[PDB]
Amino acid sequence: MKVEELIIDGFKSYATRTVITDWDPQFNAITGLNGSGKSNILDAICFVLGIASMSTVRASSLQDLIYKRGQAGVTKASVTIVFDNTDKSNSPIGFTNSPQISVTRQVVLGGTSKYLINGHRAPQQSVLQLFQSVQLNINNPNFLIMQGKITKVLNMKPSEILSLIEEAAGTKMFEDRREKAERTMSKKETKLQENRTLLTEEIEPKLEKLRNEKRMFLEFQSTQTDLEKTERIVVSYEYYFDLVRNIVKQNEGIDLDTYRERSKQLNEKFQELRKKVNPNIMNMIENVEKKEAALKTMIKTIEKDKMKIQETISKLNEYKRETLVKTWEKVTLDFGNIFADLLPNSFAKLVPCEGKDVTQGLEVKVKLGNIWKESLIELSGGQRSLIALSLIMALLQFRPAPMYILDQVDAALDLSHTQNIGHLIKTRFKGSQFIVVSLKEGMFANANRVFRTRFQDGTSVVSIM
Amino acid sequence: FSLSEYLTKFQTTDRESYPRLQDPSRELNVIIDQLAVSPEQIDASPDSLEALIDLCHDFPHLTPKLQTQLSYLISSSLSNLSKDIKANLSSNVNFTEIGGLIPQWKRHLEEYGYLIQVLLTFLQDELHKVSSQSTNLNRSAKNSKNDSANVELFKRDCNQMENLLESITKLLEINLSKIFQTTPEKDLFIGLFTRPLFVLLEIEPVTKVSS
Numbered sequence: 193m194k195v196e197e198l199i200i201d202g203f204k205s206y207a208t209r210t211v212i213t214d215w216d217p218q219f220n221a222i223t224g225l226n227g228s229g230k231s232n233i234l235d236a237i238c239f240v241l242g243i244a245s246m247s248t249v250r251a252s253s254l255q256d257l258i259y260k261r262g263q264a265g266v267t268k269a270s271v272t273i274v275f276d277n278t279d280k281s282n283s284p285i286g287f288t289n290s291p292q293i294s295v296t297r298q299v300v301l302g303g304t305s306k307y308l309i310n311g312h313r314a315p316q317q318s319v320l321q322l323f324q325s326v327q328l329n330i331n332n333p334n335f336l337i338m339q340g341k342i343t344k345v346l347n348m349k350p351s352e353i354l355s356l357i358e359e360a361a362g363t364k365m366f367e368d369r370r371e372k373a374e375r376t377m378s379k380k381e382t383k384l385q386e387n388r389t390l391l392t393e394e395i396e397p398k399l400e401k402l403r404n405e406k407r408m409f410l411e412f413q414s415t416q417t418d419l420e421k422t423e424r425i426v427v428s429y430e431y432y433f434d435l436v437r438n439i440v441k442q443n444e445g446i447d448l449d450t451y452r453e454r455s456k457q458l459n460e461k462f463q464e465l466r467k468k469v470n471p472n473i474m475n476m477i478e479n480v481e482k483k484e485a486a487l488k489t490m491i492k493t494i495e496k497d498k499m500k501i502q503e504t505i506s507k508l509n510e511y512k513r514e515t516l517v518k519t520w521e522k523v524t525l526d527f528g529n530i531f532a533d534l535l536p537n538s539f540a541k542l543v544p545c546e547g548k549d550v551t552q553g554l555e556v557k558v559k560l561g562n563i564w565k566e567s568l569i570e571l572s573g574g575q576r577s578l579i580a581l582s583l584i585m586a587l588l589q590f591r592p593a594p595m596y597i598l599d600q601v602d603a604a605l606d607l608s609h610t611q612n613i614g615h616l617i618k619t620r621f622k623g624s625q626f627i628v629v630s631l632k633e634g635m636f637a638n639a640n641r642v643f644r645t646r647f648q649d650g651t652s653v654v655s656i657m
Numbered sequence: 658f659s660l661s662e663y664l665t666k667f668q669t670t671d672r673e674s675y676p677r678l679q680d681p682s683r684e685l686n687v688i689i690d691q692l693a694v695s696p697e698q699i700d701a702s703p704d705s706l707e708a709l710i711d712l713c714h715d716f717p718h719l720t721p722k723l724q725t726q727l728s729y730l731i732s733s734s735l736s737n738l739s740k741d742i743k744a745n746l747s748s749n750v751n752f753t754e755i756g757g758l759i760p761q762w763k764r765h766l767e768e769y770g771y772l773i774q775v776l777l778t779f780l781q782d783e784l785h786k787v788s789s790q791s792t793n794l795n796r797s798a799k800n801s802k803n804d805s806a807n808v809e810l811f812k813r814d815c816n817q818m819e820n821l822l823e824s825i826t827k828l829l830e831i832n833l834s835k836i837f838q839t840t841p842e843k844d845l846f847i848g849l850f851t852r853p854l855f856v857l858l859e860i861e862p863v864t865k866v867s868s
C-alpha cells in the first residue's frame with residue numbers, strides 16, 4: 193500500500209484543502225522551517241489511521257484537531273489518504289479488485305468522528321481491521337517514531353519491546369482479541385451464572401407447584417365427568433319428549449332425595465375447585481415444560497460453546513509462542529548485524545528477562561567493543577537513536593510494513609550518521625514507503641521526493657521542492 | 658378405536674422414532690380405492706385401522722406425490738363426512754337413527770382428528786425445519802438452485818396446509834355439542850384441532866402469507 197495522494201481538510205495547521213501528490217514509493221522526505229506543519233502532516237496520517245490516546249497527536253480533545261479549534265470558519269476536519277494497489281501481495285483482504293483505496297476520517301464540532309472508505313461510510317472497526325492487516329496499527333506501532341521519541345525507545349518497558357516483535361510476528365491482533373475475549377467471556381459468564389441461579393430459585397419451584405395443580409386438575413376433571421353424567425341424569429329425571437323416556441328406561445327408579453343431596457355435594461366441591469385450579473392448566477404445563485426443556489438445552493449448548501472456545505484459544509497459544517520464538521531469533525540476529533553495520537565495533541541483542549520467559553518481555557543489551565553494557569542508561573542520545581533505528585530496520589528485514597513514519601530521528605545523530613541513514617534508506621532498506629521529517633540536509637538530500645512545508649497567511653502549504 | 662391413549666401415545670412419547678413400512682404405495686393406493694367410494698369404511702376392519710394409523714405416522718418418510726395425495730385423502734374424507742353429518746343433523750329426522758350413527762360418527766371423528774393432529778404436527782415440524790435455516794421464504798423471488806426447491810417445498814406444504822384448514826373449516830360448521838356430549842371430550846376434540854395451529858403460528862413466514 194504505497195501512498196499516492198494525501199488530502200487534508202481543516203486539520204490543525206491546515207485550513208484549506210491541501211492535496212499532496214507525487215509520493216515516491218521508496219523515500220519521501222518532509223522539510224521546512226520551525227512551526228511550518230510537518231508534524232501536523234504526520235499527525236494527519238496518524239489521525240486517518242486511527243488514534244485513541246490523543247497525546248500522540250498532541251491534543252486534549254477531538255475538536256482541538258480542527259483549524260483554530262473549529263472557531264475560525266472551518267468547522268470540519270477531514271483527512272483523506274489514497275493508497276495504490278499495483279502490488280497485490282501487500283493488499284488487504286477483499287480489496288484486491290480495486291486499484292486505489294481511499295480512507296477518510298471526518299470530525300465536526302460537538303460530536304465524534306466517522307470513517308469512509310472509497311466514498312462509502314464505514315465504522316471504526318472496519319478501517320481498524322483494514323489497517324491492522326498490513327500491520328499499520330497506530331495504537332501499538334512498530335513503524336512510528338514521533339518527534340522527540342527516538343532517544344526514548346530504549347526506555348520502554350519489556351512488554352512494549354515484546355509487542356514490537358509480536359506485531360512483526362503477526363500475533364498482536366490475536367493477543368488483544370484474546371484478552372478482549374477473556375473479559376467478554378467473564379462478563380457473560382457472570383450474567384449466565386445469575387441466570388442459572390434465577391432458573392434454580394424461581395422456575396422449578398413454580399414448575400412443581402404447576403405439576404401439583406396438574407394432578408389436582410385430573411381429579412377435578414374426574415369430578416367434571418361426574419357432574420356431566422350425574423347432574424344430567426338428575427335434570428332428566430326431574431324434567432319428567434321421547435328422548436327423556438329413553439334415558440329414563442335405563443335407570444328406572446332412582447331415589448330423588450339422595451340424588452339431590454349428591455348433586456349438592458358435587459356442586460360444593462365444584463365451587464371449591466373452580467377457585468382452586470384453572471381449567472386450562474394442561475396446555476399451560478405443556479408450554480412451560482417445552483420452555484424449560486429448550487432453556488436447559490440452550491444452557492448446555494452455551495457451556496459446551498465456552499468449553500470449545502477456551503480449548504481453542506489454549507491450542508492457539510502454543511502456535512503463537514512458537515512463531516514468537518521463531519520471529520525473535522531472526523529479528524535479534526538482524527538487529528545485531530544492522531547495529532554492527534551502522535555503528536562499527538558494536539553489537540546488540542534482544543534477550544528474555546532474567547529468569548522469566550521470552551513471552552514475558554524482552555530487553556535490549558548493547559556491546560561496544562568486547563564489553564557488555566549492564567545498563568543502557570549510560571549511552572548517548574545518538575547511540576540510543578542508532579539502536580532504536582536498527583531495531584526498527586530489523587523489524588523491516590523480518591516483514592516490511594508499507595509505511596515507516598520517522599519524525600526527526602536524526603536530531604541526536606552527527607553529520608556522518610545522518611548521511612549514512614539517508615544512504616541506507618535509499619540503497620539498502622528498499623521495500624517500504626518512508627515518510628521522514630528532517631531539518632538536517634544530509635538526510636533529505638539523499639531523498640527521492642522532498643516536500644517543503646511553509647506557513648503563509650494563517651495556513652500551511654506543502655510545496656513539492 | 659379410542660382417542661385419549663392414542664393422543665398421549667403421539668404427544669408425550671417420541672414422534673420421529675416411528676417404524677418405516679416397506680412398501681407404502683400399494684397399501685395407501687388400496688386405502689384410496691377403499692376411500693374413493695366410501696370415506697367411513699376404515700372402521701369395520703382393524704387391519705385397515707392399524708394400516709391408516711401407521712401410514713399417517715410415517716409422514717416425514719414418504720415421497721412428495723404420495724404426501725399430497727394423502728393430504729387430499731384426509732381433506733376429502735373429512736369434507737364428505739362433515740357434509741354427511743351436516744345433511745343428517747340439519748334435516749328434520751328423529752333422534753333415534755342419528756343416535757345410532759353417533760358412535761360411528763364420534764369414533765370416525767376420533768380417527769380423523771388423530772390423523773389431522775399428526776399431519777399438522779409433522780407439517781409444522783417440517784415447516785419449522787425449512788424456515789429455521791433460511792432468510793426469507795414469503796415469495797419465490799431472488800432464489801438459487803436449492804433455494805427454489807426450498808421455496809417450492811414451502812409452497813407445497815402451505816398448499817396442503819390450506820387444504821387441511823379447508824377441511825377443518827368444513828368440520829366446525831356442525832354443532833359438535835350434538836356429536837360430543839360432555840365438555841371434557843369436546844374440550845379434548847377442539848383442543849386437538851386447535852393446538853397444532855397455535856404451535857404452527859410460531860413460524861414467522863407462516864403468518865406472513867395471507868390465505
Ligand SMILES: [Mg+2]
Nearest residue numbers: 230231339599
Ligand atoms: Mg515537529
